[PDB]
Design a protein around this ligand. Structure first.
Ligand code: HEC
Ligand code: HEC
Ligand code: HEC
Ligand code: HEC
Ligand code: HEC
Ligand code: HEC
Ligand code: HEC
Ligand code: HEC
Ligand code: HEC
Ligand code: HEC
Ligand code: HEC
Ligand code: HEC
Ligand code: HEC
Lengths: 494, 494, 494
């Protein structure tokens, strides 16, 4: 093994990664599995989670783990936790739940009756310290049914199904070791199962939720993303300029704000179903659609009217037309790139071919840009990786750059037209190299066999694609009509 | 076509991109041209703009597009727009134009007479709602001649000619479909034609203009740029630390600020010609010049004295000498890279050679690093792309990192020495691959022909290089002496 | 030369880079050495510094350079500098040193006696303007012995030895021209030799030092780093949300803060030896260690208790276990990558082989991933560069992403699992190309010789590896036991 050789060269014994030894460049450590619990969803036969899933899907995983015993009153919760977890108490004392002086007389009710007392630690977590509860939106619904019903009103691609569908059914999550993608589970699960993603516990302050910081921890990246798209627009620059002195205590409403934030435009008038204002779900802009077409007029008009809070509607209309035009141009480059990549596959010059790689997460040796394949950036060919990057990392983000008025990210920036250009050159470069090698090998009669490292290795060998077998899919999950579903190749049903 | 094949594989009909259909990965959609208007400048015979250029070059493109009819008084503008575009009115009411209580008695005059009344919507836009005006600096000049004259005093590479010259004459803009580069036109045109780039409409607040946020929406990137260079210096960190509590109402003046901002150093004492403090124009640091040489002493001394607002002049002098030294070292790596790239061209081993690519925007098949060629990151070879990245994205930004005291971006960061190192390896890697292929093909007698995808494709076919013909340049534009010009290969004149 | 040819093509004379000429793309300029002074440390025989090192290692390099003569009283320092360097005086007047009204009666003493007077310019810099002093922590120790002793209590990898060891002994610094790495010397030297890195001169405000801005100018990057890791966690988002209105005047203490900052967690209770709270030094996470192993329990428990200021200890424990699991998974990908890269070397297919490159900074032609080699991103093969990037830029930062609770940077972001994936594909791609070339060349009988540009060039020729000779190491430095040392190949001792 690599570890055995490295052990003799660097003079450090081989051992398990988890024993506490400081391994020199990690060279002689052997991978050990962390403790797992079973994952939920249609791939439950092999999907794993780390036990810390208890906090994010508590209905299915939460158990008692406290060493403190007793049945306590609310005031006892506060007195002790003032010493034991002081900031939780400080947050709670600065919240409407724990302070009547900041209440606005909203008219909150539980079981038809007004909630006039403080809402304490015990009211949300329980009175028995050995049977403490870790809540979800189901608790909040007792007293905030409107916000909860909206939070639960989204379709696929919204907070509503972020975890239940888009973690448990998603290829990139199910195809990887659980501990590699813990952050995916939690980011998506906080969005779905909690009410603290925007207004954090334990202050639960709406003023905090109106700030772009309420969204950007999740809405960033693929490198750049809507955070960078917003922050590099003039709206984002004005947010930075005015944040410290503007009145964040004002409701999200026409005329209450000079500078628009994520919440202002997407949680219009406090609507807790922010997805619904979108024209149409486009798989993060990977699917091409002209939002200015006659069939989408009601949606376009609604956006124009939102912009009219602070602008001429003609100006707004022009800007959204620039989006449509910019998006349509961006897809010519993706189609150019796709032709080159698929062309290489049809000619059999891709190295490795699907047969030379580890099997995909379905357990098949299928080209990733075919229907039934798994588009990905890992455990695949360079050509396939670059293709996925073109469509996901770049083409989708061009739409986001136009949607958020980032002149820079539309053009020179990350996720831009010019990044698409450069990626197209990279793809053509790979393709050209592949074709020059194949042409030479053909002519001189060399029989090329793709290297073993495309197929086997310490990480590649951990992939679940190796252990897929017939009948390992819970197709009853996919038969459910109460949630939407991803169109996975092994779904087994409609 | 690609669309036809994809249509049969994915089961979605081919169609135009603009009909509103949600196209699966955009695979079966066909590119349609957006509505265009003719562009201005020396390439007016084929340059196009989207119609939204009306807002940014209104003198040449603005037309009535309102549905509201009438001739109104100022107070009528305000009453109705309070409902129709509330934030504009709120901004205006919080501006000196719309509120006497915040005026400073500057002594503003129009046609020799003092402006003592409110300056309302009608005073800037007109009284007739069917003949509304969209202004430029020409309006502001009526009452603010000093600021306007300075705004118009810059040379090439300043706000003064950002659009008129550096959009309308620039290869990367004229060589691309209009809708791909809308953001370029607007970013550059806002800088040139407007007075709202730093102090935004409709508050027009100088305190806002003093903040780095007044500059960073435009002065960012190539990936990193002067924003990142400033933000990652100790000055930038202190700006973030002190922004919320410092007094931004103070004039840009020696002793009024602890933390220097872009405006402080470049709009010294409120000068609206920020380019003039620069030692010399260097094409964004792509041209090498030692700013510490005896011939530039007056400029260096002026910078040292600016720094002396808050520092020892000896310290400042040392720091600017570090810039000079760091810059000069950076150019050894670019010259190393250029030798390798040009060497490959001279040996004819570049794939594709210029003849194998689409023609450049001049309509020629010329190597991009020759005089008369078009240095670019798109529609070119990987080797040429990497070269352009070395000089533009990296070498120029090394200067910016030193100029703005970013220890990190000088060394490990984006646009740094170490990024130059890595790019040099990438260039040598490409060169080495090209030479190994050519050596093999020579010896075995394979006649390599560069792939068709370097030349043709859905995006490449839209490029204006294909439709260039003799006599399509307005050389009278280039003959103008009232504006500077870019030294374009097809200029036809001096 | 390149310059001579370029001179004839572009029509600009060859000349020295430093004469002030504006060189077109820098093509015809010739590199000149800047003025140097000798560097300190074990490579003093050839290590150079720019003379500006005077400010950062003043004990060894500071000299008089003032034109102002006289012996002055404190009040005279202030009166004149109010005109000459106004912000220094403004800072000083707003500091406890210069204003009794903001003193807290800490009980500061010098030579056993209470310091009750103002501490003026002369008290820190001297009274004679021709013998002015540029201080280090040695000055501050006179009145602040506790903070200084802690600042000096760190081991290797802390502020305490940042410059003395990790600049003067480090391969990447000693192997490069001085002016390329000025920023390295200063960043590391400010951390070691000064007391102004966090609370800047001349205000020396602890409230400023508590902010993340006190750390991020140095603690950023390798592209992303702990700044990005912190800023993209929910803690970082809350810092941005609350910074403008929170009370930064509160001591770093349990219950004084809702949002934790770098200082809060690493300078626990004002401890000026922030390294000591770390479990173990791991060379920036390049060495693999399971911080959750039984042997590290005291450290893990201490972190859990720190988190318990604001959280359940069970939650904190789970989060740190996610770190351990995530880190261990990350090292499988590095070991996979290392096997591929070393495998290529063992098979002799790396282009260039070490013999085809310039010598490393030791003066040897050694493969960079061997013991005694120099792991690097510059002046090496693409395969070796990509390897260094995998372990340093990526694998180390995965640990940082988990340590700072950045769900995004653990997974999709910079320095993440998915970036590791992509880098692994890049490495395998390079390896596969190298093996396909070698297999062809073998079969057709082509004797490949690696290109000259891997070995010689304008930058490569400046490297100190060329001028290394026996007996050029000051091994007495490495024999010192009062400082730690790097395990350099040419150390000559234990
Ligand atoms: C009833 C028993 C409650 C439950 C369970 C939860 N909340 Fe609540 N909430 C409650 C009251 C009586 C109040 C004050 C209403 C008033 O008249 O002002 C609140 C208020 C909030 C708000 C607004 C906070 C503010 O504006 O400062 C938030 C955002 C909020 N509550 C959130 C919230 C969440 C996420 C809950 C589940 C975990 C939750 N509440 C439960 C009553 C009750
Ligand atoms: C971000 C996407 C949010 C999520 C997820 C949740 N809330 Fe929210 N909340 C959000 C903002 C931006 C605001 C202010 C909106 C406004 O109109 O300005 C709020 C407000 C609240 C309130 C106060 C309502 C009141 O009448 O003033 C409550 C009670 C509240 N939110 C409840 C709540 C619950 C129960 C949620 C999950 C189950 C929840 N919110 C999620 C931001 C977002
Ligand atoms: C108003 C000025 C906006 C602000 C400020 C923010 N966004 Fe936005 N977003 C805006 C529009 C007009 C669009 C296009 C919608 C269309 O149907 O035309 C978008 C789109 C997005 C999306 C995707 C929505 C989808 O495709 O349906 C997301 C996820 C998104 N926006 C998020 C986002 C965040 C987090 C913001 C702050 C950082 C933000 N937006 C600001 C308009 C506005
Ligand atoms: C929070 C820090 C995120 C992490 C970690 C990952 N995802 Fe994500 N995801 C996030 C956002 C805000 C978006 C919405 C973008 C929008 O414009 O819609 C997404 C979207 C997805 C999707 C949809 C993909 C598609 O079909 O278009 C999927 C299925 C998804 N995310 C899953 C997922 C998983 C499991 C990840 C790691 C394996 C991953 N995401 C990381 C936020 C975040
Ligand atoms: C005369 C008819 C005006 C025209 C046309 C424009 N402005 Fe003006 N401006 C005008 C007055 C009377 C004032 C107040 C002067 C006073 O005594 O304080 C101003 C002020 C400004 C300022 C400063 C704002 C402030 O400090 O709060 C700005 C930055 C400004 N004006 C900008 C500006 C621009 C960009 C214009 C063109 C679009 C413009 N003004 C036109 C009078 C008149
Ligand atoms: C950024 C590059 C700017 C552009 C473009 C314009 N202005 Fe400006 N303006 C700028 C700043 C940083 C400040 C404050 C400078 C200071 O001394 O502190 C200002 C100020 C104004 C003022 C007020 C002048 C007064 O006497 O107090 C006015 C009237 C104004 N600016 C006018 C103006 C006009 C007409 C411009 C374009 C035609 C314009 N500014 C552009 C920042 C920048
Ligand atoms: C003073 C401390 C500065 C601050 C703060 C900002 N910049 Fe700067 N800039 C500074 C100098 C000393 C230099 C070099 C000028 C030379 O002649 O020596 C620069 C250079 C630039 C440039 C290029 C100018 C040119 O080449 O002539 C630009 C475009 C620039 N600076 C922009 C910029 C911005 C937008 C800033 C804030 C984000 C900023 N600078 C801060 C000094 C100072
Ligand atoms: C605003 C978001 C920008 C976008 C979009 C683009 N450009 Fe730009 N440009 C911008 C800045 C602030 C700078 C000045 C940098 C400095 O140090 O001088 C520039 C510079 C240019 C130049 C000069 C190039 C040279 O010869 O050195 C050109 C000709 C130019 N910019 C044109 C241009 C076009 C048309 C773009 C898209 C096709 C592009 N820029 C994008 C700001 C921004
Ligand atoms: C001790 C408490 C000091 C007092 C009181 C003053 N200065 Fe200072 N200064 C001090 C140190 C530790 C340093 C070295 C840099 C660092 O950050 O550690 C300095 C440096 C200077 C400089 C040179 C650097 C610069 O920014 O230009 C000068 C010109 C200087 N200080 C001036 C000076 C004046 C005039 C003072 C009285 C108002 C003064 N200093 C007080 C620490 C101390
Ligand atoms: C004695 C002669 C001093 C020397 C030399 C330095 N400092 Fe000092 N410092 C001194 C006093 C009398 C005070 C005020 C104590 C009080 O009772 O409040 C201070 C205070 C500071 C602090 C705290 C500042 C504050 O809270 O606002 C800082 C951070 C500080 N001093 C830093 C510092 C540094 C870095 C020095 C070396 C360059 C230094 N001091 C020297 C007395 C003396
Ligand atoms: C960042 C890593 C720092 C360095 C390097 C130095 N100091 Fe510091 N200092 C730091 C912070 C975050 C704080 C506040 C800590 C708190 O408990 O909240 C301080 C505080 C000071 C004080 C005030 C102590 C008092 O009793 O209130 C002084 C006098 C001070 N620091 C001195 C000092 C000196 C002499 C240092 C270098 C020699 C130094 N500090 C370095 C941040 C950091
Ligand atoms: C508490 C919530 C933290 C905040 C806020 C910051 N960091 Fe941190 N850091 C934290 C821990 C629990 C760890 C792992 C330590 C271990 O032994 O378990 C880290 C680690 C780092 C490191 C490396 C330390 C080492 O390996 O021993 C550095 C250099 C670091 N942290 C820096 C850093 C900075 C600059 C921060 C703000 C931007 C920051 N940390 C915030 C916990 C906490
Ligand atoms: C400030 C802007 C930096 C620059 C410039 C460079 N380094 Fe650095 N370095 C910095 C930080 C905050 C860290 C600590 C990270 C942690 O988690 O420990 C480091 C670390 C190093 C090390 C340790 C490498 C190892 O053996 O693991 C070395 C030897 C080092 N830095 C040296 C160094 C040199 C000389 C650089 C340029 C040649 C370089 N660093 C740049 C901060 C910064």
């Amino acid at each position: 093994t690599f570890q055995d050789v490295a052990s003799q060269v660097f003079g450090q014994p081989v051992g398990p990664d988890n024993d506490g030894t400081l391994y020199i460049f990690g060279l002689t450590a052997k991978y050990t599995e962390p403790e797992y619990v079973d994952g939920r969803g249609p791939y439950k036969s092999f999907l794993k989670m780390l036990p810390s899933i208890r906090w994010y899907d508590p209905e299915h995983y939460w158990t008692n783990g406290s060493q403190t015993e007793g049945v306590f009153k609310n005031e006892e919760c506060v007195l002790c936790h003032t010493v034991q977890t002081p900031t939780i108490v400080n947050d709670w004392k600065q919240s409407s739940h724990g302070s009547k002086d900041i209440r606005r007389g909203i008219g909150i009710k539980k079981d038809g009756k007004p909630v006039e007392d403080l809402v304490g630690c015990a009211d949300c977590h329980g009175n028995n310290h050995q049977k403490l509860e870790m809540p979800t939106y189901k608790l909040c619904n007792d007293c905030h049914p409107k916000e909860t019903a909206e939070h639960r009103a989204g379709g696929l691609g919204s907070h509503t199904h972020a975890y239940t569908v888009n973690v448990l059914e998603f290829s990139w999550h199910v195809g990887k070791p659980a501990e590699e993608v813990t952050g995916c589970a939690h980011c998506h699960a906080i969005a779905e199962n909690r009410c603290s993603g925007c207004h954090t516990r334990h202050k639960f302050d709406p003023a905090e939720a109106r700030k772009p910081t309420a969204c950007r921890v999740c809405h960033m990246g693929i490198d750049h993303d809507e955070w960078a798209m917003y922050n590099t627009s003039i709206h984002g620059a004005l947010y930075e300029a005015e944040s410290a002195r503007m009145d964040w205590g004002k409701k999200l409403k026409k005329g209450n704000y000079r500078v628009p934030t994520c919440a202002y435009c997407h949680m219009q008038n406090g609507d807790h179903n922010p997805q619904r204002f979108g024209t149409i779900y486009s798989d993060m802009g990977m699917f091409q659609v002209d939002r200015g077409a006659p069939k989408h007029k009601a949606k376009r008009d609604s956006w124009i009217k939102l912009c009219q809070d602070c602008h001429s509607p003609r100006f707004a209309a022009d800007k959204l037309k620039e989006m449509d035009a910019g998006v349509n141009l961006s897809f010519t480059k993706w189609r150019e790139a796709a032709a080159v990549i698929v062309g290489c596959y049809l000619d059999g010059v891709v190295d490795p071919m699907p047969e030379g790689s580890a099997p995909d997460w379905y357990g098949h040796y299928t080209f990733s840009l075919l229907p039934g394949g798994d588009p990905r950036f890992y455990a695949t060919s360079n050509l396939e990786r670059l293709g996925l990057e073109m469509i996901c990392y770049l083409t989708g983000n061009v739409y986001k750059a136009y949607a958020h008025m980032s002149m820079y990210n539309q053009t020179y920036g990350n996720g831009s037209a010019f990044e698409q250009d450069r990626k197209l050159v990279e793809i053509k470069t790979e393709a050209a190299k592949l074709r020059r090698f194949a042409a030479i090998e053909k002519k001189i009669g060399l029989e090329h066999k793709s290297a073993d490292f495309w197929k086997h290795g310490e990480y590649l060998d951990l992939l679940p694609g190796w252990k897929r077998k017939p009948g390992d899919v819970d197709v009853e999950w996919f038969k459910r009509t109460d949630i939407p579903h991803r169109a996975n190749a092994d779904a087994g049903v409609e």
